[PDB]
């Protein structure tokens, strides 16, 4: 017995990852075929708030980091896959690998022909 | 709805003043500008040197941001494509996100007034 | 809703230590700094050379992001508008931009735990 009770199809990855891992990562993400990218370069810190560097028998932190800010502007069906290879070719099994954050976008236009769309990523 | 968005342009670095001058013109004044680098779908340039071939897939572009009534998005893309275009591939890319709130830092001013 | 949002803003530089330190203080601590340029609805500012005007019409400025759980939004932009704010034009603006998704590189963890 039971008692009765009371899109565009386009998005942003944008994933901060460590300068040493860049290389490692666009290339499979070119050899995946996700090429279209736009990278800077950014500081950061996590959770962890930095680290901590010592001298003098004195702890100082040091509480922003260089970091590379990799952003693809997708398919939205191409998303799981552009995360799982993020991840797995940043990670190195430390803290201060990276995080992908995932943001909508509605529209998307090449310069040169003025295509708009999916067709324009 | 917000009826605010964010403009997220990559385009080239010898473009910046032309397309920043015409949005100026057109009074879209408010922008945000980074140094990038980037490819597109052709994935880089390949530079010659000694009988070599190198593919160059990170090239340097400009990022302008504007966060903008949702209104003016047509007109803004329009100029942004008119002034960024040069006929040759690496041109550029338009981006538009959404954009929930805005906040004037001095004043506190919240919303469309604070664009 | 995914209750995870991107707060962005734009700040002067001399103001991004006192800025992050209070952040800090009040437990928000993951964050972005970007190094970029910009202008408000000013469009910049008039330097002057033997009596004559020019037009600067891009300044140093600081830009934070911080992805957020979407509760301590309010919180973290009267945080941003406190301590950046000094009375004078070019104080900053903060934009708050949805976030649909969070993954942590190191462990694949998702969402709101990942923040
Ligand atoms: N919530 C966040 N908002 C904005 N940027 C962030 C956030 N979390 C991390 N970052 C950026 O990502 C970089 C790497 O973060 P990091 O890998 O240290 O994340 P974490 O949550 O602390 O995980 P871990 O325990 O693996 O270190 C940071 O230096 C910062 O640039
Ligand atoms: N899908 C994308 N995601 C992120 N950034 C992109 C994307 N496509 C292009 N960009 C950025 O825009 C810049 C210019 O792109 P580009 O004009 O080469 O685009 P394209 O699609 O290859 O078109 P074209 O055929 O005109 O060259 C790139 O270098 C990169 O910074
Ligand atoms: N609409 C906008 N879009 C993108 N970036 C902006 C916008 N408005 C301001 N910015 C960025 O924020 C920085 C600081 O802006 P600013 O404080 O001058 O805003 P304002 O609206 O002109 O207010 P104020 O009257 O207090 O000067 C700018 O230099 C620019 O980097
Ligand atoms: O970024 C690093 O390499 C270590 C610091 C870190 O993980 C953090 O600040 O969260
Ligand atoms: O960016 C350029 O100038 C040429 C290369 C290009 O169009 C691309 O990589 O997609
Ligand atoms: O950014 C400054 O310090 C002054 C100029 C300004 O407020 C603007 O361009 O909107
Ligand atoms: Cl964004
Ligand atoms: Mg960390
Ligand atoms: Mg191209
Ligand atoms: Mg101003």
Wanted: proline share 2%.
């Amino acid at each position: 017995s039971h008692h009765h009770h009371h899109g565009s199809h386009m998005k942003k990855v944008e994933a901060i990852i460590r300068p040493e891992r860049l290389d490692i990562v666009k290339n499979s993400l070119t050899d995946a075929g996700y090429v279209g990218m736009t990278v800077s370069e950014v500081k950061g810190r996590g959770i962890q708030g930095g680290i901590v560097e010592r001298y003098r028998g004195r702890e100082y932190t040091v509480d922003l980091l260089p970091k590379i800010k990799i952003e693809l502007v997708v398919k939205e069906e191409d998303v799981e896959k552009i995360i799982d290879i993020i991840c797995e070719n940043a990670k190195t099994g430390n803290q201060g690998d990276g995080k992908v954050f995932i943001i909508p976008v509605e529209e998307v236009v090449r310069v040169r022909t003025k295509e708009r769309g999916r067709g324009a990523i």
